[PDB]
């Protein structure tokens, strides 16, 4: 069956901006349509046979390609426009969608606020215990957060969570969280959340001290 | 081993037709023979010309004498050389569309009112079968007037001016209920009227 | 809407189409010795409605003497037909190319054809095949 | 204007079978095809069927063979797919759609129904107070939160000050843990003097247990 | 003398069947058609002999082909209209033809294009009508 | 009702249009009846309902297609039948066997302009509206302009018999208002009529 592959995977453009967006398909197609899906929600047609803009769809859409070479651009970014587009054939046989590319909105590069909490009296219970980092309005998306313990390194015990753009804000906040045992927590003493970013000039940590001011 | 010249016949009136080659156009004299017959009908076999028409003593054209004309069957005419036989020609001429009639006679103009005028006019054999074309002007306008006719062959001219001239003359056409000819017939002589 | 020119027929290579997309039309022609029906149809046309594709007009011949979205198959054979048929393709048409019986295809890239539209003007892509016996 | 709609979400235990529906309106339904679409949490699309109502023909990808069926009742024009052997990787959206023929699209589209296979069941919501700290202090903001643990199943809805406040209040997507239960935080940025006085609480309800807990946050 | 309104009834009926295929030729042969070429490529089978009004059979036979033809000029800015153009030519050379009749048309073994059908049978028009007159 | 002197008139347009005139009157009031068409030689009916015109006739339209399309031909017989509601059951007051091209009247002929005016001349040319192909040149036509101090009636008829969309009037008077009317008929038919005279075209000429 034919594999649909778009790139780029994640596109950030500024409001106003001309950008174009490629799907490619393994063997020639005669068409592809595409389609746009907002968060949290069905798609919906875009552009059927390859230039027919749908019934509906903003004009400042269009698209036009041929074999196994096809493009979706915009005239100009909008703030209607942050959602993810796929692609789509039915030349044979199963029908095939891309992968989907997601549109983001620019912004001048921002640094994240750093802040951390250690765990609250109740959470001591069942031998369980956690502490989060949080990063605020930082843009872009690319950030990383790494965990040291008494100057240890972690891994294999941390996850983490990334929010939507803002609407208007048009930024992201990141929040890690690492669990450990109680009886590991109490043996410890020094804890950090080193975080690397665009915006930071050099790495910033933030630490607490258990049992201390 | 030059191509032959092509032929161009006329029926004129379904009375005879006319066939003429340009023969001098070789560069020697050349006793050009012309071969006929009618394909896909009755009688398919080849006959040759009886009455030939020359110019400068060689041969240039020939006639048929209204016997041999079939209109609505197909006439292929085929023209060979003498000296090499090998050199010969076909074409394929459909004569109903090649008809040329007679110019109309005797043209008369008569007032159906005071100031409203009727052309009337002959065609010698082929009534139903022929278009015309009423040509009419005056000495103060610059330029012919035209207007196409139907087989009733009768032309009204309302409101003529007692003051001006006028002249009328028409021509006629084998087309389009008979035929699909698109040569006129020679213009007829023209008839005067008024001061 | 119809292509007006036929698949550029590389020498030594014939082709054929997995599908016909709405609005092709095959010539209804038979074998020497043998001639349409009389009151009978000059082609076959691929029609469809919002879920269904067919083809219209039943071709027929006397002694002269799964589905795919928008496209029709092949018409199955009928009685005494010529030896070749005959295609009308459209405007977004794809037709795949092989070698003729005997030869080999010297490449490893797609034989594949399509029906373009522009400037007014469509014409198939060249297909990047070779056949060398 | 046609409209497809589905039904809600459905939760079901794995091994087991479920049938999703989509009943059809404002155009005739068998003289058109329903394809039915699946997408995993962020993995894009993919394409399961197809099933004409008014002629009981029915095409399947070699990926679905067995592992789904599409079945219609033509008196309410619904249209059903029920899904057998459930795993873990069967979770997601199920779309259904109408096919647009002569173009070989999808011209509408339902709005999803999601589908997830776990071993948890129901819990309550522990909650803990993300409490600031000088530690969180800089300048002369600070950061507080409510931290919400070992709930299932999604979702959960977090508002401060009863809904009064709206500026921030950023609310993350959940994650599992190991157990297969859920997790979650909210933060919120506030003058470090106004913490004084003004009282901050975030009131995180809890649909699927019907439980409510309004958690101070205060500085220690 | 003047014939009887019996064979001018007949005369009407030939130059209103005329005129419907020169339309017909017209439309079709008009040098913005851009689609001659095609129609130029299927087959029409003409009488064997045709100079009789028995032999308007064979037209009768063809007159199906014609409107699928037809068909196919349908485009923008073009006047005919095939099915009631068709209808008219069937009507008028059914009553031509005379139900009295019990012909079978013979067909020439060569084939021909739209353009050489029509004007045959123009032509079969015009001899009737000139030896009726 | 009483059997009173009684028409069914019908003509046809050429192309798509039988308009019928049915008067009686021994006619009761308030009665509901319709004309019903029934060719032979072709696969399709028609019916209108009578609408009043007058205390004692009526009219209506059997429009058979587009305005300007060939639904009919020489070789066509139409039964037009005249049918009054009494209850349930239709009753067949009329019956005429229509042969539309024997019947003919066209429409009045349209798009009259002044092509050209002068002192005492002036070119007027027109249109003819639906008017079939079947014709061809076989079509005559009827004009008459109007002058000061006279009236429509009195005023020469003038006479084209031959297919001319043109006329050039002649001597007319500098700086006088006129009118011009025309109207045509087809040669063929035997009762065929002079189609309505058209709108009259109001033209002025030139000062000396
Ligand atoms: C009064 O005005 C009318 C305007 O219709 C004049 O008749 C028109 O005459 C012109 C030539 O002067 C005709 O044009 C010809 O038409 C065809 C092509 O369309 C072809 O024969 C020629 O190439 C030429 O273009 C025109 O058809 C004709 N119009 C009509 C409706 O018949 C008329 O001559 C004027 N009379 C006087 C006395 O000035
Ligand atoms: C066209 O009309 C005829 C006749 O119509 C009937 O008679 C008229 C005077 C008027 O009263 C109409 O309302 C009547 O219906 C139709 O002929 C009938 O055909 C049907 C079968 O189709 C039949 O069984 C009847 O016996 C026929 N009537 C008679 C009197 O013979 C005819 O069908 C109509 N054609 C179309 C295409 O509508
Ligand atoms: C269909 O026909 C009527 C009748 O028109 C008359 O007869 C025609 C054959 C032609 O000669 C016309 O000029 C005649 O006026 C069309 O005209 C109207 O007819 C009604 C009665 O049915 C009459 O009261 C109106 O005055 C007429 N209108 C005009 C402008 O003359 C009628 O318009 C035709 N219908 C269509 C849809 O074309
Ligand atoms: C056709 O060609 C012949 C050629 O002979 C013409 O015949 C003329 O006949 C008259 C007597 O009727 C002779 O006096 C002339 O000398 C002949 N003319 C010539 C040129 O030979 C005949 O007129 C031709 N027809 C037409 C219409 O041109
Ligand atoms: C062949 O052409 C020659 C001339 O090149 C013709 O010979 C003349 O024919 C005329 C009559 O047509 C005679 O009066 C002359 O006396 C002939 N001249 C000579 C020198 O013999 C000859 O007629 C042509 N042949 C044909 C069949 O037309
Ligand atoms: C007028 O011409 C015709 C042929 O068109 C001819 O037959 C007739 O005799 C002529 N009349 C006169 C009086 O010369």
Redesign the pocket.
Same mark, same amino acid.
Request: hydrophobic share 20%; charged share 10%; no cysteine.
């Given at each position: 069956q034919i594999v649909l592959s778009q790139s780029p995977v994640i596109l950030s453009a500024s409001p106003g901006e001309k950008v174009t967006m490629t799907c490619r398909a393994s063997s020639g197609v005669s068409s592809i349509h595409w389609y746009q899906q907002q968060p949290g929600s069905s798609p919906k047609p875009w552009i059927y046979d390859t230039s027919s803009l749908a019934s509906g769809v903003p004009a400042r859409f269009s698209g036009s390609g041929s074999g196994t070479s096809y493009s979706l651009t915009i005239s100009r970014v909008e703030a209607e426009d942050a959602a993810t587009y796929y692609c789509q054939q039915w030349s044979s046989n199963p029908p095939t969608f891309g992968a989907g590319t997601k549109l983001e909105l620019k912004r001048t590069v921002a640094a994240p606020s750093v802040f951390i909490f250690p765990p609250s009296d109740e959470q001591l219970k069942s031998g369980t215990a956690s502490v989060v980092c949080l990063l605020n309005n930082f843009y872009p998306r690319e950030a990383k957060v790494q965990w040291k313990v008494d100057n240890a390194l972690q891994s294999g015990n941390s996850q983490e969570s990334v929010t939507e753009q803002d609407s208007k804000d048009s930024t992201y906040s990141l929040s890690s969280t690492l669990t450990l045992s109680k009886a590991d927590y109490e043996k410890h003493k020094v804890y950090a959340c080193e975080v690397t970013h665009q915006g930071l000039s050099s790495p910033v940590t933030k630490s607490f001290n258990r049992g201390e001011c | 081993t030059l191509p032959l010249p092509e032929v161009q016949c006329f029926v004129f009136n379904v009375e005879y037709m006319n066939c003429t080659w340009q023969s001098s156009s070789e560069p020697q $004299?050349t006793?050009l &023979?012309l071969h006929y017959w009618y394909k896909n009908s009755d009688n398919d076999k080849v006959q040759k010309c009886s009455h030939?028409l020359?110019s400068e003593?060689? &041969?240039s054209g020939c006639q048929l004498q209204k016997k041999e004309i079939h209109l609505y069957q197909t006439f292929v005419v085929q023209l060979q050389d $003498?000296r090499e036989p090998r050199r010969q020609a076909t074409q394929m001429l459909k004569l109903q569309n090649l008809v040329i009639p007679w110019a109309p006679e005797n043209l008369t103009l008569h007032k159906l009112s005071e100031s409203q005028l009727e052309l009337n006019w002959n065609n010698r054999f082929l009534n139903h079968c022929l278009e015309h074309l009423v040509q009419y002007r005056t000495d103060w306008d610059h330029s012919w007037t035209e207007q196409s006719v139907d087989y009733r062959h009768k032309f009204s001219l309302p409101s003529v001016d007692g003051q001006k001239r006028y002249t009328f003359r028409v021509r006629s056409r084998f087309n389009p209920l008979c035929g699909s000819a698109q040569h006129w017939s020679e213009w007829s002589h023209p008839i005067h009227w008024g001061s | 809407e119809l292509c007006d020119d036929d698949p550029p027929e590389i020498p030594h290579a014939t082709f054929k189409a997995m599908a016909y997309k709405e609005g092709t039309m095959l010539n209804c022609e038979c074998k020497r010795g043998f001639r349409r029906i009389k009151s009978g149809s000059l082609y076959m046309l691929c029609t469809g409605n919002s879920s269904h594709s067919s083809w219209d007009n039943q071709c027929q011949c006397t002694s002269s003497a799964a589905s795919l979205p928008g496209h029709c198959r092949e018409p199955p054979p009928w009685e005494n037909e010529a030896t070749e048929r005959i295609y009308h393709f459209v405007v977004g048409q794809m037709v795949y190319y092989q070698c003729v019986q005997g030869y080999r295809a010297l490449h490893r890239g797609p034989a594949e054809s399509v029906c373009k539209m522009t400037h007014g003007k469509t014409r198939w892509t060249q297909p990047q095949l070779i056949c060398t016996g | 204007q046609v409209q497809l709609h589905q039904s809600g979400d459905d939760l079901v235990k794995p091994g087991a079978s479920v049938k999703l529906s989509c009943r059809a309106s404002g155009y005739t339904f068998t003289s058109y095809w329903i394809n039915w679409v699946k997408q995993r949490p962020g993995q894009g699309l993919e394409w399961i069927g197809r099933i004409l109502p008014g002629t009981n023909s029915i095409y399947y990808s070699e990926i679905f063979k067995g592992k789904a069926s599409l079945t219609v009742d033509t008196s309410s024009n619904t249209a059903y797919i029920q899904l057998s052997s459930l795993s873990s990787e069967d979770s997601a959206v199920y779309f259904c759609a109408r096919l647009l023929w002569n173009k070989g699209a999808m011209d509408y589209w339902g709005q999803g129904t999601s589908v997830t296979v776990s071993s948890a069941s129901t819990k309550g919501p522990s909650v803990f107070p993300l409490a600031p700290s000088s530690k969180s202090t800089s300048g002369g903001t600070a950061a507080l939160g409510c931290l919400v643990k070992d709930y299932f199943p999604e979702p959960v809805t977090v508002s401060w000050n009863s809904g009064a406040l709206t500026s921030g209040v950023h609310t993350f997507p959940a994650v599992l843990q190991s157990s297969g239960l859920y997790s979650l935080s909210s933060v919120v940025t506030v003058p470090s003097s106004s913490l004084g006085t003004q009282t901050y609480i975030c009131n995180v309800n809890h649909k699927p247990s019907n439980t409510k807990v309004d958690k101070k946050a205060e500085p220690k | 003398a003047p014939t009887s309104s019996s064979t001018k009834k007949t005369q009407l009926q030939l130059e209103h069947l005329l005129l419907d295929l020169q339309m017909i030729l017209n439309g079709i042969n008009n040098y913005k058609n851009p689609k001659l070429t095609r129609m130029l490529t299927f087959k029409f089978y003409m009488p064997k002999k045709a100079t009789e009004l028995k032999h308007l059979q064979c037209l009768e036979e063809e007159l199906k082909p014609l409107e699928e033809v037809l068909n196919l000029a349908q485009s923008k800015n073009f006047h005919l209209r095939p099915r009631d153009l068709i209808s008219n030519i069937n009507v008028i050379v059914l009553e031509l033809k005379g139900s009295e009749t019990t012909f079978m048309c013979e067909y020439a073994d060569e084939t021909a294009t739209i353009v050489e059908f029509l004007n045959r049978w123009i032509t079969f028009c015009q001899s009737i009508i000139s030896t009726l007159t | 009702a009483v059997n009173g002197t009684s028409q069914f008139t019908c003509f046809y347009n050429s192309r798509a249009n039988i308009s019928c005139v049915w008067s009686q009157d021994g006619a009761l009031q308030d009665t509901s009846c319709q004309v019903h068409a029934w060719p032979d030689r072709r696969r399709w009916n028609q019916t209108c309902e009578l609408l009043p015109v007058s205390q004692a006739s009526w009219a209506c339209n059997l429009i058979l297609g587009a305005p300007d399309s060939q639904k009919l031909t020489t070789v066509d017989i139409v039964t037009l039948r005249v049918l009054c509601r009494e209850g349930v059951r239709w009753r067949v007051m009329a019956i005429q066997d229509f042969k539309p091209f024997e019947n003919l009247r066209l429409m009045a002929p349209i798009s009259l302009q002044v092509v050209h005016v002068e002192t005492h001349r002036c070119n007027i040319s027109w249109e003819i509206s639906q008017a079939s192909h079947y014709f061809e040149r076989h079509l005559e036509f009827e004009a008459r302009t109007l002058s000061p101090g006279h009236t429509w009636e009195e005023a020469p008829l003038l006479t084209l018999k031959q297919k001319q969309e043109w006329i050039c009037l002649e001597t007319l008077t500098p700086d006088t208002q006129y009118e011009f009317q025309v109207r045509v008929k087809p040669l063929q038919g035997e009762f065929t009529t002079w189609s309505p005279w058209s709108q009259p075209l109001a033209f002025r000429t030139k000062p000396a």
């Open positions: - | $004299p006793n &023979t030939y020359f003593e060689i &041969t $003498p | - | - | - | -």
